[PDB]
C-alpha cells in the first residue's frame, strides 16, 4: 500500500523539511558515543511516504483525540529515529515500534531534536553502530529518519533530567 | 505498550537539566502519528 515520491530540493517542501533536521541537531551529553559526532548533515534523499489506509486510520484518531480535548489534537511534527524504519512506512507504527524500557514507560518516543532520534537509527544507545563498520559514528553509510505527524492530544508534562 | 496516564493522550519529557535540549514526547497508540516523510542522510565529519 505505501508509495514513496521522490522530492526535488528545489521543491520549498524539501527546503522546509531539511531545515528542520540541520537546525534542530545540538550535542548530547553522551559526547557522541550514541549518535556519532557531527554539526550537521549531508542529506542524500526526501521522500513523501503515501499510503491511504495508514493516513485514514492517523485521521480517525486524531478526531477522536480532538473531540476529547475542546476540539484541538496539538498536531505536531517530529522526529523519530528506528531500526524498524522499513516496517514502520510500509505497516504503520504498532507495540513492535515501542522503546520498551523508556524513561516515560513503553511507548514509541519522538524528539523536536533530530540529533536524538539518530542517536535510535542504529537501534537502542546507536547498537553496534553501522551494519558494514560496526562504526556509530560512521560518516560513510546512509542513515534514515522519520519526520512525521503526531497527535499529542492533552499530553502529562514530566519536568525531568 | 503501556496506557497514557489517566486523562491524557500523551507524555511531554520537558528537559529540566540541559539547557539547550528541546523536548521529547511519547505516545501509547500507534494510530496517533503518520509517517510523513523519510529522509536519507549521512552525518558530516566536522572540520
Ligand atoms: N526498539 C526500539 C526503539 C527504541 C527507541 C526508539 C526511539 C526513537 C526516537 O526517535 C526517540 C526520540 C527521543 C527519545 C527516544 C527515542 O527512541 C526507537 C526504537
Ligand atoms: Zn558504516
Known sequence: ??????????????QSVEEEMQS???????????????????????????????????????????????????????????PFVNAIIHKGFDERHAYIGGMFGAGIYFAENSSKSNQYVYGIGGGTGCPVHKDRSCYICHRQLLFCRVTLGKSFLQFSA | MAHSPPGHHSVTGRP????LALAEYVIYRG?????????????????
Open chain 1, 24 to 82: 534542530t541537531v545540538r550535542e548530547h551529553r553522551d559526547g557522541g558515543h550514541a549518535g556519532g559526532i557531527f554539526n550537521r548533515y549531508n542529506i542524500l534523499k526526501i521522500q513523501k511516504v503515501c499510503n491511504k489506509k495508514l493516513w485514514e486510520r492517523y485521521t480517525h484518531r486524531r478526531k477522536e483525540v480532538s473531540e476529547e480535548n475542546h476540539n484541538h489534537a496539538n498536531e505536531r511534527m517530529l522526529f523519530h529515529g528506528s
Open chain 1, 1 to 14: 500500500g505505501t508509495i514513496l515520491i521522490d522530492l526535488s530540493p528545489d521543491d520549498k517542501e524539501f
Open chain 2, 16 to 19: 529540566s537539566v540541559n539547557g
Open chain 2, 31 to 47: 494510530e496517533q502519528a503518520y509517517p510523513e516523510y523519510l529522509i536519507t542522510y549521512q552525518i558530516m565529519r566536522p572540520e
